[PDB]
């Protein structure tokens, strides 16, 4: 249903291979209880807009050096990426809000 970060040159190499789509960058872990909770709210949505938005998971603790380049200091941490630029991001389990911005993002 995601797409699993493997390292940061496989980060750079979805977001150049997403074209024009809406990338959401997922910054979760496995010791993250609120990202347990968002996760599948993210999947289902990802799952009626397979056409427009790629769902990327940064593990973190697989990716430290990604978390130190994305700056995340909160768990979970949602990035929005269009044409390999940076558009918005916010942290926390927060549905509504990411439902609102890949809406106006998409």
């Not at 909770?37 to 603790?61: R, Y």
């Not at 990716?63 to 558009?87: H, L, Q």
Request: with cysteine; net charge negative; charged share 30%.
């Amino acid at each position: 249903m995601s797409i699993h970060i493997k390292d940061s040159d496989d980060l750079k190499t979805r977001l150049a291979e997403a074209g024009d789509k809406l990338v959401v960058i997922d910054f979760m872990a496995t010791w993250c209880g609120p990202c347990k909770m968002i996760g599948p709210k993210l999947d289902e949505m990802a799952g009626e807009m397979q056409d427009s938005i790629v769902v990327v998971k940064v593990d973190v603790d697989e990716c430290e050096d990604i978390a130190t380049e994305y700056n995340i200091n909160s768990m979970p941490t949602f990035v929005f990426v269009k044409n390999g630029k940076k558009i918005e991001e916010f942290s926390g389990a927060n549905v509504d809000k990411l439902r609102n911005t890949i809406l106006k993002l998409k």
